[PDB]
From a paper:
All these PLTs were composed of a single-chain amino acids that folded into three distinct structures: a receptor binding domain I, a translocation domain II, and a catalytic toxin domain III. Cytotoxicity associated with this family of toxins is due to their enzymatic activity and the ADP-ribosylation of eEF2. Our analysis of four of these new members by X-ray crystallography presents the defining three-domain structure typical of this family, despite substantial variability in the amino acid sequences of these proteins.
Primary sequence alignment of PLT proteins indicates that K57 is conserved in Spx but not in the others. However, superposition of the crystal structures shows the presence of a comparatively positioned and positively charged lysine or arginine residue on the same β-strand (β4) in Cfx, Hmx, and Jlx. Chx266hGH, Abx259hGH, and Sfx257hGH, were the most efficient in transporting hGH across SMI-100 monolayers, while PE259hGH, Chx266hGH, Abx259hGH, Cfx259hGH, and Sfx264hGH were superior to the other PLTs for transporting hGH across AIR-100 monolayers. Remarkably, loops 1 and 2 of all PLTs superpose well with PE, whilst loop 3, which is conserved at the amino acid sequence level, presented more flexibility in our substrate-free structures and may regulate access of the catalytic site to diphthamide. Although we were not able to produce active toxins due to safety concerns, our structural analysis shows that elements involved in NAD+ binding and ADP transferase are conserved in all PLT family members, supporting their putative ADP-ribosylation activity. Only PLT genes in Aeromonas hydrophila, Chromobacterium haemolyticum, [name], and Shewanella putrefaciens matched the core gene GC content. The GC contents of three toxin genes (PE, Chx, and Cfx) showed ascending trends, while others showed descending trends, not aligning with phylogeny trees for this toxin family.
Numbering used by the authors: 0 to 31, 40 to 284, 287 to 619
């Protein structure tokens, strides 16, 4: 047993029992290019007399062990204290983990998570990966100078005990080359677990979408450095919610998450770099800037579609102070579509925040944490019972995850770049193998495409009857092509060419892809479509395919947003053209090769069983 200082790797590699005393801090060393360290140990504590144990993680955190909760208490470079609580729910065992990045240009946040366990080392649940931004002094301190320590905060009768098993630290190397933007792109997502042999089982179990997708260092070697850490954990009984809780010191959470959605930038990439290295000139900074500027005018976020339009066309606006409004006007006129994309996303994020936090100000939203929930990519709604004080980011897959290692596509007025007919077929294979089917063509603006393909298909406000809300697609490219452009003209009235996208939905949704012969503008559409799906509109986890409004010689598919948010989109090879904007689709331009992969799903014409 340990009644003083110790050596964790030596003493607790298999088992050691700490006789926690108040008034005594039992300390240990933690000594052992680019990569991740995963410190791990399995705990069984005894705090039966209401003892509270305090485990100092070097200089950056403190874990408090109470009988019914594991509490983490953080200290970044901000100085201010941030506290969290994880419920044990009667569990007597638990794992303590934390992930430290090492490198010259590695991330500047450490992660800390607990797992509740049964007697037999089976996962019962997992905590959020609590992320904590730390200074360069703190980052330099690993792996060689860092220490761990155990103590009891309170004086009680009885004897506080902490039995540690299977203490260890494992390294995993960053991949060779890999553009830094991409290399660490999963540091702030659930997929971080995929870098970790013990836990790679869990993420794959939850999503099913596999760790195959993303920069998850497939070829990496999860290697031990010291002690004897647990090597593998079994998939739990029920599916756990994998989630990362991320903080923003600058109080720019809405700006950041908006950038993330609009531009498809890793939340990690929008955080302190060790080596500053503006390469976010094209999308990142503008989008964030729009949110800041919009906030400064105090305009309701729901009115934004109107507002942006007015500022584009020199129509008045209800702002008392003209200076912030003008700052916005200027930025809006320079990039009216990107302004429209940016504040659309921000609007959705903020609407959700208020649903979890009634009467909360944008200013408050800006200082909230982001809770990146990797959804159980199957059932229905992941984000559930928000911890109040978080912006909930639901992580489903994105088109970009299915693209080759080649130079990533981009959406110019000349057209889609680095996108040939080979990459589409190869990317179509992956989507098939991964259990998706083509649902239809989608036409969007250039900036709309970067949003959808890289940031993912996220719900946006729309000037649509609340009932008919959803992502619109179409079997016939002609119908989608109508919308492959800026939604409206700038101050000169110019409408740029856009981009043609291919939306794919998951195969497992096929029973829920309904079809009617009745026009969607027909009065009795709402009732008939409701009869087909089992509830009144709007559309949840189901699609609807029917005749477009008017005579309309084509079929329009509306994906419900819940389905849409699980849907994925890649670039079509059907080009738009800068000279012909406003014309119909010239069918010469649609290749046969792409036509052959665009067979449509077998729609259902009868309500599901009851
Ligand atoms: Ca692995």
């Amino acid at each position: 047993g340990i009644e003083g200082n110790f050596r964790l790797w030596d003493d607790c590699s298999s088992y050691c029992l700490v006789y926690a005393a108040p008034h005594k801090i039992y300390q240990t060393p933690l000594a052992t290019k680019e990569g991740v360290l995963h410190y791990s140990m399995v705990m069984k504590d005894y705090v039966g007399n209401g003892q509270v144990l305090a485990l100092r993680l070097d200089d950056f955190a403190t874990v408090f062990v109470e009988q019914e909760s594991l509490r983490l208490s953080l200290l970044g470079s901000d100085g201010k204290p941030r506290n969290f609580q994880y419920a044990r729910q009667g569990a007597k065992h638990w794992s303590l983990n934390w992930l430290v990045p090492v490198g010259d240009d590695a991330p500047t946040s450490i992660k800390v998570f607990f797992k509740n366990l049964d007697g037999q080392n089976n996962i019962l649940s997992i905590s959020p990966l609590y992320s904590v931004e730390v200074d360069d002094k703190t980052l330099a301190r690993w792996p060689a100078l860092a220490t761990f320590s155990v103590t009891q905060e309170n004086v009680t009768q009885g004897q506080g005990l902490l039995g540690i098993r299977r203490a260890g630290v494992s390294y995993v190397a960053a991949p060779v080359n890999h553009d830094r933007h991409k290399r660490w792109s999963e540091w702030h997502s659930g997929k971080l677990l995929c870098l970790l042999d013990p836990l790679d089982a869990i993420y794959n179990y939850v999503s099913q979408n596999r760790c195959s997708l993303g920069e998850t260092w497939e070829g990496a070697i999860y290697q031990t450095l010291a002690g004897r850490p647990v090597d593998k954990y079994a998939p739990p009984a029920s599916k756990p919610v994998i989630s990362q809780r991320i903080h923003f010191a600058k109080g720019n959470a809405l700006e950041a998450l908006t950038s993330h959605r609009v531009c498809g930038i890793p939340l990690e990439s929008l955080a302190r770099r060790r080596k500053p290295r503006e390469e976010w000139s094209s999308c990142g900074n503008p989008a964030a800037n729009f949110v800041a500027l919009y906030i400064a005018t105090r305009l309701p976020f729901d009115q934004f579609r109107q507002v942006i339009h007015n500022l584009v066309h020199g129509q008045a606006v209800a702002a008392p102070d003209p200076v912030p409004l003008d700052a916005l006007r200027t930025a809006v006129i320079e990039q009216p579509e990107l302004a429209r994309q940016s504040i659309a996303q921000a609007a959705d994020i903020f609407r959700n925040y208020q649903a979890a936090n009634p009467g909360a100000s944008a200013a408050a939203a800006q200082q909230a944490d982001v809770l990146a929930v990797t959804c159980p990519a199957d059932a229905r709604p992941c984000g559930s019972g928000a911890s109040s004080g978080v912006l909930v980011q639901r992580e489903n897959p994105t088109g970009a995850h299915f693209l080759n290692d080649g130079e990533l596509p981009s959406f110019t007025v000349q057209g889609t770049q680095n996108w040939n007919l080979n990459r589409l077929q190869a990317a179509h294979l992956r989507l098939q193998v991964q259990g998706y089917v083509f649902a239809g063509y989608h036409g969007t603006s250039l900036e709309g495409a970067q949003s959808i393909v890289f940031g993912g298909i996220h719900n946006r406000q729309q000037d649509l009857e609340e009932i008919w809300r959803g992502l619109y697609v179409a079997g016939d490219p002609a119908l989608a092509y109508g919308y492959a452009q800026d939604a409206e003209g700038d101050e000169r009235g110019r409408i740029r060419n856009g981009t043609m996208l291919r939306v794919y939905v998951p195969r497992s949704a096929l029973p829920r892809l309904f079809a009617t012969s009745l026009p969607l503008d027909h009065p009795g559409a709402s009732q008939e479509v409701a009869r087909l799906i089992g509830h009144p509109l709007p559309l949840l986890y189901e699609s609807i395919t029917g005749p477009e409004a008017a005579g309309g010689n084509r079929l329009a598919t509306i994906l419900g947003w819940q389905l849409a948010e699980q849907a994925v989109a890649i670039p079509s090879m059907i080009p738009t053209n800068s000279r012909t904007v406003g014309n119909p689709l010239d069918p010469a331009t649609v290749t046969l090769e792409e036509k052959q992969i665009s067979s449509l799903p077998g729609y259902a014409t009868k309500p599901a069983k009851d």
